[PDB]
Design a protein around this ligand. Structure first.
Ligand SMILES: [Zn+2]
Length: 31
């Protein structure tokens, strides 16, 4: 029983399917 967690950017609220996509986003997101 393992769900499918999803990463979300708190700076804006972009839906990030994974950490890899989340990392690239936060790296190029408005600080
Ligand atoms: Zn963001």
């Amino acid at each position: 029983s393992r769900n499918i967690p999803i990463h979300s950017c708190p700076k804006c609220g972009e839906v990030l399917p994974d950490i890899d996509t989340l990392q690239i986003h936060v790296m190029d997101c408005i600080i």
